Nucleic acid binder design. Structure first.
Lengths: 38, 51, 134, 120, 175, 61
RNA sequence: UUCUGGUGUCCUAGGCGUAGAGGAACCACACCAAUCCAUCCCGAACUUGGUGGUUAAACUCUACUGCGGUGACGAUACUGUAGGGGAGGUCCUGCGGAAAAAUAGCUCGACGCCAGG
RNA sequence: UGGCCCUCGAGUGCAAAGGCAGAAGGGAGCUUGACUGCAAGACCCACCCGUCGAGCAGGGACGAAAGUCGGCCUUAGUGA
């Protein structure tokens, strides 16, 4: 089966939001995403 | 190795109408034992013809 | 002189039946050596004639062995004709029927072509004659 | 393929006629997003003996917000084709799903046709 | 949730761009698939279980243990010996995990040429795939001690060579 | 030395040509594989033989 | 009584390519959720249940000969018989049958059947 | 691991030929019909052998039903 419930805990807030207003749950918790290349 | 091997019913030697052992030889046993429900024995239906 | 792949080792004989079509008009060259008499032509004849017109031309113009043997003929030893086990490794043969082109030669002046193809006709087992590219 | 739901359904039917082999009085379905068609046809003379469709029940009742096929409208189309050959003299009829797997509402078309005395 | 704005904001730009007559032609990310080529999943049964556990946890649903199309001699490859592990995931989990690629595979690689368009966009219709960078932060990374292939492939309704690349550019995949 | 010469000699013709009289049960074709397929009123056999079911005529088409 | 898809049967077989035309009805996709169900992973298919937006795709219809298919007559090969020539390999006439190939061409099929608006 | 041409060039346990791409190719679901009593008529045909078989009765499998199933794509794998 291997359900995952990909809605609740989603971490993904970038330094420069607007481009990243969204965020989504799953099985991952850190709400921060690196700016990386630009 | 494909040795022959015959199957057999549920004997019940009786004083009824001709009842009698019903062998059915078949082949191929290179395995563990295989019974099968070959049928139309002396009694009409059948099930689990062993050996 | 022979094929590379031995599709089938031995191959029994056939027979000639005169050309009526595919008279092999002319394709390369400008002067051909048209056969007239049906016969076989081994690969060793082919060698011979080729040598003849190559060393005779010797200055220009290109030869064209228009036909390639591709069928084996066997020969048996002197053992009372029992069973035809092995003779295909012996010569190969091109069945050449009438009306067929054997050589073609271009880039050569007229009469030089006549001597090349006339000599070449001497090395070869059947009466031919040379044709121009009409 | 590219007409996935056309090659698929169509040929799947051709399968049902290759080996399944219904030849004598055969009833065939066709379920489209708006309707259900059904035919009782004979191979010998190649004419539809007795048809029916969701263009005769909807004269009285149907619904569009649904898929034109719903278990109940199918119930009624098997109802009608039944009570059509229930009076025409066609006892056994070679049912053939038109390529649609037999589960689902073509169930209901079958059982609908069965309840009204079609030797099936 | 990459889906929604993708549906209302960046559809009109392609629709106006190509100058269609029907939005019905505009391309979309049809499906992806992630697979993990394995040297010998046969002889590492708990490596088959490594495919199950890891590749299942990473993406939405379970994997698919893949059977040998045809055998290869020399190697222990009968027709069926599982060498390859895939998950033909689609629907919208597709959006969530190309999302976590945009979000946890763009940032945490080490080399960056990015994405060469004319590279891995070559087709009659797109099959865009990437090699390596299999590991993610969520999974405990220090368990593996070996290399292992992988694919991340894609499809599309339009058959240019850029509009699905541009679709990756309209999303978090420039170079 | 010869190695050769092991031919079977089997026979497999068409038995009832188009527009002959077919008994019922009679064989139309005994064939190796299915050159002629069964049409209607004929039955395939175990080894692809094609035999008539009802009296009449055979029509190859 | 055309048109719409529903099934089929003689067949030259029927198509791919370029073109167009089709939305009131029909057909099909986009859309939506999930009992029955179903995905060896996925509602992709299959399923049931909804919205019912375009004709884009697909299907249908009218053209096309650029391909594909088809295909002649005539002539000639060959061959039945009756004969002949050649040291042979093999060749030639008389009466009868008669092509493959190529080329010109010929087709983008003909009919039924039922529910319709 | 995804996208385009395709003539059935893939395979079909083992040789070749004929066959088969609604497949006889591959994979699933359940199962033992690789049953008993048989059989009009055919094919082959020195004899001995050999091959196919509509259809019926019993008792079943599968299948919703129609239907198919008395061995294996067919011809070798066997001897009075």
């Amino acid at each position: 089966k291997s359900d995952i419930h990909p809605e609740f805990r989603e971490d993904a807030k970038v330094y420069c939001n607007g481009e990243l207003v969204m965020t989504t749950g799953g099985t991952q918790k850190d709400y921060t995403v690196e700016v990386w290349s630009g | 190795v494909k040795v022959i091997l015959e199957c057999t019913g549920c004997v019940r030697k009786s004083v009824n109408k001709g009842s009698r052992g019903v062998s059915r030889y078949i082949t191929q046993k290179n395995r563990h034992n295989t019974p099968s429900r070959l049928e139309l024995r002396k009694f009409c239906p059948y099930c689990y013809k062993h050996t | 002189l022979s094929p590379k792949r031995t599709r089938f080792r031995k191959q029994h004989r056939g027979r000639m039946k005169g050309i009526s079509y595919r008279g092999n008009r002319i394709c390369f060259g400008r002067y051909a050596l048209q056969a007239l008499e049906p016969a076989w032509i081994t690969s060793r004849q082919i060698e011979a004639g080729r040598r003849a017109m190559t060393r005779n031309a010797r200055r220009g113009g290109k030869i064209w062995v228009r036909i390639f043997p591709d069928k084996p003929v066997t020969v048996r030893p002197a053992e009372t004709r029992m069973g035809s086990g092995k003779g295909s490794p012996e010569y190969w043969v091109a069945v050449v029927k009438p009306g067929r082109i054997l050589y073609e030669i271009s880039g050569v002046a007229e009469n030089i072509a006549r001597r090349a193809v006339a000599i070449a006709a001497s090395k070869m087992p059947i009466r031919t004659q040379f044709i121009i590219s009409g | 393929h590219t007409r996935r739901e056309d090659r698929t359904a169509r040929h799947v039917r051709i399968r049902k006629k290759v080996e399944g082999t219904p030849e004598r009085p055969r009833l065939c379905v066709f379920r489209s997003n708006k309707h259900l068609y059904v035919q009782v046809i004979d191979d010998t003379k190649m004419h539809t003996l007795a048809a029916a469709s969701t263009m005769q029940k909807a004269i009285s009742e149907n619904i569009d917000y649904s898929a034109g096929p719903t278990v109940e409208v199918a119930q009624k189309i098997g109802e009608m084709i039944a009570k059509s050959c229930l009076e025409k003299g066609i006892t056994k009829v070679a049912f053939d799903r038109g390529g649609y797997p037999y589960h689902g509402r073509v169930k209901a078309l079958a059982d609908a046709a069965r309840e009204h005395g079609l030797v099936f | 949730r990459l889906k929604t704005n993708y549906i209302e904001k960046m559809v009109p730009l392609l629709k106006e761009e190509f100058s269609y007559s029907n939005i019905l032609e505009v391309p979309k990310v049809v499906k992806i698939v992630v697979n993990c080529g394995i040297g010998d999943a046969s002889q590492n049964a708990k490596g088959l279980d490594a495919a199950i556990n890891e590749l299942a946890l990473i993406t939405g649903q379970r994997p698919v243990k893949t059977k040998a199309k045809t055998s290869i001699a020399g190697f222990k490859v009968r027709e069926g010996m599982t060498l390859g592990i895939a998950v033909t995931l689609r629907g919208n989990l597709m959006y969530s995990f190309l999302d976590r690629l945009i979000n946890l595979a763009l940032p945490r690689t080490r080399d960056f040429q990015g994405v060469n368009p004319n590279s891995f966009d070559g087709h009659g219709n797109y099959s865009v795939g990437f090699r390596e960078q299999s590991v993610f932060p969520e999974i405990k990374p220090e368990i593996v001690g070996k290399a292992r292939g992988m694919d991340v492939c894609i499809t599309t309704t339009a058959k240019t060579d850029k509009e699905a690349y541009k679709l990756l550019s309209l999303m978090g995949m420039p170079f | 030395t010869k190695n050769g010469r092991d031919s079977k000699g089997q026979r497999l013709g068409v038995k009832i040509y188009g527009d002959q009289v077919a008994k019922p049960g009679a064989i139309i074709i005994r064939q190796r594989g299915t050159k002629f397929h069964p049409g209607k009123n004929v039955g395939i056999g175990k080894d692809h033989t094609i035999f008539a079911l009802i009296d009449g005529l055979v029509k190859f088409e």
